[PDB]
Amino acid sequence: KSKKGKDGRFVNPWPTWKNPSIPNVLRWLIMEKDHSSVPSSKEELDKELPVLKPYFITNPEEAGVREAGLRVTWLGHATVMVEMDELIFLTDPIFSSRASPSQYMGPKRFRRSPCTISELPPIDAVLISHNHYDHLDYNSVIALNERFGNELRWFVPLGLLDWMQKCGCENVIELDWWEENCVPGHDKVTFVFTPSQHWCKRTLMDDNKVLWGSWSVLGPWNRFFFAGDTGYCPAFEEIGKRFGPFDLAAIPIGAYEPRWFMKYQHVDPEEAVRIHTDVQTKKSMAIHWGTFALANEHYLEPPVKLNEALERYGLNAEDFFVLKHGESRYLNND
Amino acid sequence: SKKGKDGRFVNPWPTWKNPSIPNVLRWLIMEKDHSSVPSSKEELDKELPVLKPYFITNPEEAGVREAGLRVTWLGHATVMVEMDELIFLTDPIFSSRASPSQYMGPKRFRRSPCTISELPPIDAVLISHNHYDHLDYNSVIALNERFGNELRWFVPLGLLDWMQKCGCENVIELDWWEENCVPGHDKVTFVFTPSQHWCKRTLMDDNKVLWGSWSVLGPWNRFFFAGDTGYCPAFEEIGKRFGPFDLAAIPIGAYEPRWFMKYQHVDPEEAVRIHTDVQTKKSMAIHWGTFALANEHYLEPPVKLNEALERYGLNAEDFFVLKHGESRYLNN
Ligand SMILES: C[C@H](CCC(=O)O)[C@H]1CC[C@H]2[C@@H]3CC[C@@H]4C[C@H](O)CC[C@]4(C)[C@H]3C[C@H](O)[C@]12C
Ligand SMILES: C[C@H](CCC(=O)O)[C@H]1CC[C@H]2[C@@H]3CC[C@@H]4C[C@H](O)CC[C@]4(C)[C@H]3C[C@H](O)[C@]12C
Ligand SMILES: C[C@H](CCC(=O)O)[C@H]1CC[C@H]2[C@@H]3CC[C@@H]4C[C@H](O)CC[C@]4(C)[C@H]3C[C@H](O)[C@]12C
Ligand SMILES: C[C@H](CCC(=O)O)[C@H]1CC[C@H]2[C@@H]3CC[C@@H]4C[C@H](O)CC[C@]4(C)[C@H]3C[C@H](O)[C@]12C
Ligand SMILES: C[C@H](CCC(=O)O)[C@H]1CC[C@H]2[C@@H]3CC[C@@H]4C[C@H](O)CC[C@]4(C)[C@H]3C[C@H](O)[C@]12C
Ligand SMILES: C[C@H](CCC(=O)O)[C@H]1CC[C@H]2[C@@H]3CC[C@@H]4C[C@H](O)CC[C@]4(C)[C@H]3C[C@H](O)[C@]12C
Ligand SMILES: C[C@H](CCC(=O)O)[C@H]1CC[C@H]2[C@@H]3CC[C@@H]4C[C@H](O)CC[C@]4(C)[C@H]3C[C@H](O)[C@]12C
Ligand SMILES: C[C@H](CCC(=O)O)[C@H]1CC[C@H]2[C@@H]3CC[C@@H]4C[C@H](O)CC[C@]4(C)[C@H]3C[C@H](O)[C@]12C
Ligand SMILES: C[C@H](CCC(=O)O)[C@H]1CC[C@H]2[C@@H]3CC[C@@H]4C[C@H](O)CC[C@]4(C)[C@H]3C[C@H](O)[C@]12C
Ligand SMILES: C[C@H](CCC(=O)O)[C@H]1CC[C@H]2[C@@H]3CC[C@@H]4C[C@H](O)CC[C@]4(C)[C@H]3C[C@H](O)[C@]12C
Ligand SMILES: O=S(=O)(O)c1cc(S(=O)(=O)O)c2cc(S(=O)(=O)O)ccc2c1
Ligand SMILES: [Zn+2]
Ligand SMILES: [Zn+2]
Ligand SMILES: [Zn+2]
Ligand SMILES: [Zn+2]
Numbered sequence: 146k147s148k149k150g151k152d153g154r155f156v157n158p159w160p161t162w163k164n165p166s167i168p169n170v171l172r173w174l175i176m177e178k179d180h181s182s183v184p185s186s187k188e189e190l191d192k193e194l195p196v197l198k199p200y201f202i203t204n205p206e207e208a209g210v211r212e213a214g215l216r217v218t219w220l221g222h223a224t225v226m227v228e229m230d231e232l233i234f235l236t237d238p239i240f241s242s243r244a245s246p247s248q249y250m251g252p253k254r255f256r257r258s259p260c261t262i263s264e265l266p267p268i269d270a271v272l273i274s275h276n277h278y279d280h281l282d283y284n285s286v287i288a289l290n291e292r293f294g295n296e297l298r299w300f301v302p303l304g305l306l307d308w309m310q311k312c313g314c315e316n317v318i319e320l321d322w323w324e325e326n327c328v329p330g331h332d333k334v335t336f337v338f339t340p341s342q343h344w345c346k347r348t349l350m351d352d353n354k355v356l357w358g359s360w361s362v363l364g365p366w367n368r369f370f371f372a373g374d375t376g377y378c379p380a381f382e383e384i385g386k387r388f389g390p391f392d393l394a395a396i397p398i399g400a401y402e403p404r405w406f407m408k409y410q411h412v413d414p415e416e417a418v419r420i421h422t423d424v425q426t427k428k429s430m431a432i433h434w435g436t437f438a439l440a441n442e443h444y445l446e447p448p449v450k451l452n453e454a455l456e457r458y459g460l461n462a463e464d465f466f467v468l469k470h471g472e473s474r475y476l477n478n479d
Numbered sequence: 480s481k482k483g484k485d486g487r488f489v490n491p492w493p494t495w496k497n498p499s500i501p502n503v504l505r506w507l508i509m510e511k512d513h514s515s516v517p518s519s520k521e522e523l524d525k526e527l528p529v530l531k532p533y534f535i536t537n538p539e540e541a542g543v544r545e546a547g548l549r550v551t552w553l554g555h556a557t558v559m560v561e562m563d564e565l566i567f568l569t570d571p572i573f574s575s576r577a578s579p580s581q582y583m584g585p586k587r588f589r590r591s592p593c594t595i596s597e598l599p600p601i602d603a604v605l606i607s608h609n610h611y612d613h614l615d616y617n618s619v620i621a622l623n624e625r626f627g628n629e630l631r632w633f634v635p636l637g638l639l640d641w642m643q644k645c646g647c648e649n650v651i652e653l654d655w656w657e658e659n660c661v662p663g664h665d666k667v668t669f670v671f672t673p674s675q676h677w678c679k680r681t682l683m684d685d686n687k688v689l690w691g692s693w694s695v696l697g698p699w700n701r702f703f704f705a706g707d708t709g710y711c712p713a714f715e716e717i718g719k720r721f722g723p724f725d726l727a728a729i730p731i732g733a734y735e736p737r738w739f740m741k742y743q744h745v746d747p748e749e750a751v752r753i754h755t756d757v758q759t760k761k762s763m764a765i766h767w768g769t770f771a772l773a774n775e776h777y778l779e780p781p782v783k784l785n786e787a788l789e790r791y792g793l794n795a796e797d798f799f800v801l802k803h804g805e806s807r808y809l810n811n
Binding site: 187241242243245246247248249257261263283284292 | 520574575576578579580581582590594596616617625
């Protein structure tokens with residue numbers, strides 16, 4: 146322990162130790178989402194954003210990794226299924242149509258989930274970046290703990306242990322910044338909770354009662370990063386130094402409109418490539434975007450801006466790629 | 480005329496039927512005890528396989544026109560019927576949970592055979608009553624969003640406000656024994672007909688809106704849809720005014736325990752009794768298999784229906800149960 150940014154707790158709750166943060170939010174009702182991307186008749190969306198059928202549906206076998214490499218599947222938004230070092234773990238699972246506490250108001254995904262809970266292979270762990278309704282889905286937790294359970298190791302930030310138990314999960318681990326743990330079975334892999342510049346909120350006045358963050362999974366064979374939700378911040382340089390080089394990093398590239406406002410909690414594609422450089426990863430996956438309209442940008446804009454920023458930094462789509470809904474990708478290491 | 484209409488108690492709608500008795504006491508702490516226990520995904524694939532509808536692989540097989548009659552079961556009471564230049568949906572529920580909340584309520588154990596975007600052009604939807612497993616807010620939004628005036632909403636008395644607040648302009652409030660039609664081709668008639676059930680969505684809105692059943696009289700085929708009901712008269716009356724019918728969709732589920740349910744939910748024997756009363760050639764067996772709204776085994780209703788069919792001198796052909804997503808072309 147020499148020079149890591151730690152928490153990061155004001156009076157009772159946690160602010161971001163990062164300097165760029167400014168405290169002023171006015172939340173989500175009808176206001177900035179509105180319709181400035183204008184998703185048209187679904188056939189348009191099928192052409193632009195085709196939802197694929199994941200490999201583990203047609204071929205339920207083959208869903209391991211056979212050590213060596215690293216397989217990844219994008220299940221919309223921040224839902225990512227990662228297979229490595231004899232483990233298959235999900236990240237920020239959202240399978241409901243609506244990311245909201247109500248059934249009558251809230252952002253409803255314009256792209257259906259590539260698969261269902263019953264159809265996915267045996268999960269060994271779930272990673273929760275923060276507690277927002279588009280990353281933490283009550284019904285999804287219910288489904289996973291109904292099919293899985295005790296066998297499902299939930300890795301959550303500080304403050305969500307109570308919530309997880311109230312949902313009905315027994316194998317739950319609260320982690321603080323730079324804290325680590327593992328799956329009981331496979332001790333060779335370590336799951337570390339690492340900083341991020343975001344916030345937490347589900348109800349009134351519980352703002353930041355629970356922590357946010359990012360996850361670093363250190364296997365013997367593969368190293369993986371998952372940013373979650375964040376604006377640009379110096380803690381990703383710290384992550385790239387302490388850990389790294391990583392094999393895959395999942396970086397949000399969406400919901401970066403009113404930068405003047407979002408920039409403190411949401412990178413844009415330029416800042417996303419900035420993250421990719423910071424974390425010292427070999428490859429990066431474009432998560433967020435494409436699933437929910439959580440900001441004002443055109444729903445196809447973030448990939449275009451990502452390619453522009455990639456060219457800016459002298460990189461190619463190979464280094465930082467965007468998948469289709471349900472598409473998979475295998476990556477074998479040196 | 481003999482037609483038994485009704486009614487208007489000193490405040491809400493009665494059933495006016497003799498058998499009605501006090502039997503409500505909402506199911507939030509009532510028979511929650513789930514003793515049918517659907518589980519074991521292996522059990523669900525074998526027991527209740529969800530089929531993939533024809534209009535998925537061949538969306539153009541919209542059928543209809545052919546003088547006959549096609550039906551597709553999309554779980555619970557959600558049924559798509561195509562005949563006599565019409566494709567109309569009935570009691571559409573596509574959400575997982577039939578509840579006003581996202582945290583409590585009956586979550587279907589058999590997911591919907593298809594989604595809203597995948598179905599062919601629907602010309603009409605029929606709403607039997609306002610319960611959360613027959614009237615689904617999100618489904619209504621979806622259809623009036625993909626569709627608009629291109630949707631004939633037929634609702635009981637008291638539901639016009641709800642539908643307009645949802646955003647539908649093509650809505651018709653009916654009192655049972657009243658008729659109407661779809662603008663384009665008026666040759667087909669939609670009639671709201673009696674039934675023995677109740678209505679409730681919130682606190683103190685008990686029976687503010689009517690329940691009932693639907694009779695669709697085309698030039699070529701006549702079709703009945705019961706909706707939700709316990710056994711009561713007027714099914715003979717329905718068989719009298721119109722009929723003989725070609726198809727009837729009769730609920731066969733959510734009947735146990737009997738002492739509580741008999742007055743608003745038929746059992747399969749009473750379903751066969753309805754089949755006889757209404758004068759239909761064939762029957763489709765709706766409700767059941769999708770949501771657990773009672774204590775009976777989730778597989779029991781088909782067995783009890785076949786037992787009652789043998790009982791009443793009828794064959795499985797006369798009263799058939801489809802699989803989830805299966806279709807059937809009842810011609811002639
Ligand atoms: C706009 C209405 C009331 C209108 C009025 O009477 O003026 C108000 C009353 C309830 C308010 C919500 C309460 C919960 C939230 C509190 C946040 O700190 C701001 C966003 C939310 C989601 C609020 C949004 C909005 O400010 C609402 C919906
Ligand atoms: C659902 C009831 C009324 C039902 C009825 O009496 O028929 C209405 C009455 C007051 C309504 C709220 C008033 C403040 C807000 C107004 C916004 O424009 C939409 C969100 C809110 C938070 C509304 C949500 C909801 O639409 C409420 C709670
Ligand atoms: C009970 C009706 C729906 C009735 C129906 O569909 O017939 C629903 C519709 C809108 C819902 C409200 C929306 C705003 C609020 C959302 C909160 O997360 C819970 C409390 C409130 C005040 C909700 C209470 C209740 O859940 C309402 C009023
Ligand atoms: C009330 C139901 C269960 C009711 C039943 O037995 O049918 C319970 C089951 C799980 C419960 C939730 C667990 C997670 C959350 C814990 C919070 O500290 C309060 C809100 C939430 C969202 C809870 C709300 C509510 O208390 C729920 C949904
Ligand atoms: C009104 C009851 C009961 C009062 C009590 O237990 O003393 C209280 C108990 C718990 C309260 C809820 C807990 C979860 C949420 C906490 C938020 O910070 C504000 C909104 C919510 C949704 C609260 C709204 C409401 O105020 C509740 C439901
Ligand atoms: C049992 C609790 C209260 C617990 C206590 O006694 O402290 C009570 C409080 C409010 C009650 C609900 C009120 C609305 C409904 C009234 C019906 O007649 C039965 C079902 C419902 C949905 C009730 C279910 C249950 O009877 C609840 C949830
Ligand atoms: C989610 C809040 C608060 C949780 C917390 O902050 O600790 C809890 C506290 C009070 C809870 C309610 C108490 C009465 C009811 C009890 C029933 O068995 C389930 C539904 C109801 C309506 C409960 C729903 C939910 O479980 C509530 C609203
Ligand atoms: C706002 C939290 C969700 C918090 C979370 O998801 O973490 C949810 C969880 C349980 C929800 C309650 C369930 C019972 C009631 C359902 C009604 O139709 C609206 C009012 C009540 C009292 C609900 C209010 C609100 O919708 C609650 C309290
Ligand atoms: C409050 C939102 C819309 C808010 C917005 O436009 O941003 C509105 C939009 C549609 C509204 C619903 C329409 C159908 C119902 C009408 C009832 O008489 C009251 C409950 C319901 C379920 C309404 C609840 C609430 O009033 C909703 C959900
Ligand atoms: C707090 C407002 C008062 C505003 C008004 O006078 O309209 C009241 C009056 C109208 C109320 C709604 C009317 C329809 C529903 C009646 C239910 O039995 C409880 C939930 C609902 C959804 C109510 C929630 C809430 O109790 C509201 C929104
Ligand atoms: O568990 S799943 O089989 O993966 C699952 C879970 C939910 S739910 O989380 O919201 O209950 C779903 C909700 C919808 S809907 O359009 O919003 O009604 C559709 C499909 C779903 C599939
Ligand atoms: Zn967020
Ligand atoms: Zn987000
Ligand atoms: Zn009913
Ligand atoms: Zn029903």
